[PDB]
Design a protein around this ligand. Sequence first.
Ligand SMILES: [Zn+2]
Ligand SMILES: [Zn+2]
Ligand SMILES: [Zn+2]
Ligand SMILES: [Zn+2]
Ligand SMILES: [Zn+2]
Ligand SMILES: [Zn+2]
Ligand SMILES: [Zn+2]
Ligand SMILES: [Zn+2]
Ligand SMILES: [Zn+2]
Ligand SMILES: [Zn+2]
Ligand SMILES: [Zn+2]
Ligand SMILES: [Zn+2]
Lengths: 188, 188, 188, 188, 188, 188
Amino acid sequence: NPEDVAEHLQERLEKARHLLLDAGLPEEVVRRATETFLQALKDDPSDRAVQDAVELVVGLAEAAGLLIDAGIPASVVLPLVERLLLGLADDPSDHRVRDLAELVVGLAEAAMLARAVNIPSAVYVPVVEKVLRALLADPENERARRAARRVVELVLAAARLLALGVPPHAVADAVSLTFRRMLTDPDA
Amino acid sequence: NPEDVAEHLQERLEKARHLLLDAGLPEEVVRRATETFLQALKDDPSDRAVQDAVELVVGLAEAAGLLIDAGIPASVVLPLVERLLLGLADDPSDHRVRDLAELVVGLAEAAMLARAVNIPSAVYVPVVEKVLRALLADPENERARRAARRVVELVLAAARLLALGVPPHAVADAVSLTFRRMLTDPDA
Amino acid sequence: NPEDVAEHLQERLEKARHLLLDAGLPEEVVRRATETFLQALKDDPSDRAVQDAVELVVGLAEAAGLLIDAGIPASVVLPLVERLLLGLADDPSDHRVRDLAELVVGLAEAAMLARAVNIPSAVYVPVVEKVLRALLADPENERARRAARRVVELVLAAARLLALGVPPHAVADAVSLTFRRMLTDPDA
Amino acid sequence: NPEDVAEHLQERLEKARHLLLDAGLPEEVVRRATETFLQALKDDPSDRAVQDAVELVVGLAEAAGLLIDAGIPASVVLPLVERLLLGLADDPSDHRVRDLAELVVGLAEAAMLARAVNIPSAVYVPVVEKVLRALLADPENERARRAARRVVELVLAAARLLALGVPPHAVADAVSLTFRRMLTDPDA
Amino acid sequence: NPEDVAEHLQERLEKARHLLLDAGLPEEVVRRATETFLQALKDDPSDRAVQDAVELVVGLAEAAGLLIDAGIPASVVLPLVERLLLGLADDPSDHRVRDLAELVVGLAEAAMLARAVNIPSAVYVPVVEKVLRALLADPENERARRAARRVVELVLAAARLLALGVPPHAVADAVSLTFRRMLTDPDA
Amino acid sequence: NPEDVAEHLQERLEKARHLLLDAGLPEEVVRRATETFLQALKDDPSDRAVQDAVELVVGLAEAAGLLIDAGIPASVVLPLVERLLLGLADDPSDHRVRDLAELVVGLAEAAMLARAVNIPSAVYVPVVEKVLRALLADPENERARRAARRVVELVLAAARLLALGVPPHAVADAVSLTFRRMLTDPDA
Ligand SMILES: [Zn+2]
Ligand SMILES: [Zn+2]
Ligand SMILES: [Zn+2]
Ligand SMILES: [Zn+2]
Ligand SMILES: [Zn+2]
Ligand SMILES: [Zn+2]
Ligand SMILES: [Zn+2]
Ligand SMILES: [Zn+2]
Ligand SMILES: [Zn+2]
Ligand SMILES: [Zn+2]
Ligand SMILES: [Zn+2]
Ligand SMILES: [Zn+2]
């Protein structure tokens, strides 16, 4: 129910504020964004756009911590998460900002799944770092968005290869070669 | 349960709309097809044909994005996906249309798996482009369907070679040679 | 778990029925065999012989399509698959019938892998055609079974040569010479 | 309601005292912490920090038992839980102590979920043992906290792989390889 | 209120006597235990130990019926419940006896919840049978108590995996694998 | 993981039993060896010697079939495989028996690769027949072991010549001459 989802999203928003504060974001930005989203939920709980924006905010709060723990420096994750949070707070129905937020959440999920499929950190951390740096440079750059989507597709293809019956070692070797090639060649 | 599957398919159908809207398809066609399928699910949730058609529609929605990201131009993917969507909307139990939709989804999956196997893009993108152009020319052409099925079988054979113990580099070399020959000669 | 494997096998059996109908088998034979196997699974899910027979049936359903797409005429594949399906349906624990079914599945897998190894179709399709014709002539002929097993071993030896470090072109040339000689001389 | 939550937390605190006594902690420490927290709840039921501290105390009481049952020796779990209990009792609003308690509760949950995922005990018990030993050595060590968070993320990624459609056996194999590498190298 | 709890426990004790008589326990033992507990409640209603013992007795009365219906033979449940009832009647404040009674009640609840999460009976009934046989052999055996606690934790981890978003089929498959391994290997 | 390897080796041992029964070995010997090895795996899964012996047994099970298909009579292969199986079953850590089993598996692999290299059967079958007859005569004869190792090295040198760039026909001619010389003179 829209009111029930609103209450659950307020709880998850408090948790997201805690996670963002622990990650390293400034207190003022987190406070402003969380207050704006909480007020938006309180005034119109039935609003779908606010609910989707809050879901994306919680996803980003988790993703920032996952990406910082993975190895990507906090000098490229924190500014990107700050800009995404501000953009979501301003216009909760700005399509490009939501697309970028889901791109970052998918990148964090792919980075956490590449470890599970036993891909070394030294081959996949550089690629995610490059993609995040390119996204931080110009948010509207289509090539960086394509690269992020291709990294997610590579991790999903590794999962599909595992499902097909290939031993985990062969899958890890092949996808590590693919990541090494993607480090230099864009269309690889 | 048929009603539970209907609800899950409604959610996946909404997600498939966005992705189709994101890909570049016209808004009117996507709206028409999605509304028709949602109404079909709502009236008769237990209908198996509608459920299979919705599954194929979601698969095509993901496949269009994967194929466009791979490198195949949107001038050959979008018309084909539009035709398949319209055919599925009209008759959700037209066997040839479902076969073609499954062929396109399998081609997208094969193109995504060829990257994980570390096959260069310049040798497999032309082959998928040619196959999709032949399919767009005449949907009932048996040679194009056979070529698509053979591409999928080649990717699966590369996976089987990886499982047999061949190093990934040798597998990539052999399958790249096979793709190069398939570019020129049909039965290659 | 035997019941879980049984349920998965019913799903794969429906898929196998679809594939066999697509291949060109008569509807009546496919319906009879599939209903018999489904009933056998439902009555005694824990039965190992029924599960093995259903696995062989799914393998044969895939193998028929692979062999028809490869180039072998449907006048030698469809009768053989029909006879194997009927034999499996009658006695799911007839050792010779299961051996022949695994021989056909292995022949299809070898034909699929010879393309990845980059062996031309014109050298390996005639040999598989001859082996399948000999098998269709007399199922109990030991020479035809030996020839099928030797074709599978030749493709596996090509994979082993690829693994040893021989370049793919040299492997293709040597195994093509071997296939050319196997066309004429039996112990080649 | 704050008073209702206070009553429920008093009941759970009695249960947690029983669990801690059964685990092997000294009677005096458990008694001291429990009476301090009960008095804090009684004087100011509406206090949020006391409620969060009591929730963490109950979580730790269950976590100690789960970790001891899993195989981790009581010589590394009991001192850590004792220190965490004393720290929570002293300052119920010390951010680092709550973070460490949440890390230990998450480690216990990950250890209990790795068994359900069907991960062998000999590959994950050593890693949790090493992480807990590092945490007991220096509580403020960031590397140990990062390692605990990475173990939790690995278990969650295994769950995500199960949700994607990979068979449980392949998931177990891949995540077991990841655990084996994490045993030796820190960023694995 | 202690007197109100005493009255409610007298009613539940009559119900528990009915359930124990239905299960198959001898009339004399049930009569003796119920009369002793009823007299203890009547003389000192405010006594906490008697109330806890009566609660455990009602739990055991339900647990015996649940375990017998589950499939575990009455030759291993009835002697264990008889010994537990006699021990509770003799000293209602014997810590080990209450711990064993709670272990049996938790085992019954785990066996009841394993069916809800769709785990086949043939994989979990043998494990509970083995645990109960080991407990009947030597009540003070720590390995059997650890095994019972681990079975309860496995069912709770299955519930947590359901809560995380894994489909019920994958959860059932993974926990069934875990149960099959627990059948042989004690630390599985 | 040792338990995972034990389970995989149990499955491969069942497959090896099937292959050995198909080859022509007596049922009693195959059953005895297989049950002994299965029990050894079950009691101590972590044992390395048992795992190596099971791997050698599977290799021998495949090698017997390959050698019989190649043309070598079953009167010299089946007794040798029987003796090797019994020796491995008795002491799974007897160095000489493992060396002889590895020699036979290598001879089968060399005979399989000599066909791919396109060496006629009439020049290499007699040499393998003579080597296997000498090995069956006296297992500890060093000359027969040296001859088997030299056959394997000749096939590997043919593969190396193919890798160097020599045309396959010249390689086949040179190695056929070498095999003809080896037929008569021992150090040829
Ligand atoms: Zn709610
Ligand atoms: Zn549902
Ligand atoms: Zn979008
Ligand atoms: Zn299942
Ligand atoms: Zn079809
Ligand atoms: Zn209440
Ligand atoms: Zn914190
Ligand atoms: Zn009352
Ligand atoms: Zn009754
Ligand atoms: Zn206790
Ligand atoms: Zn495994
Ligand atoms: Zn057989």
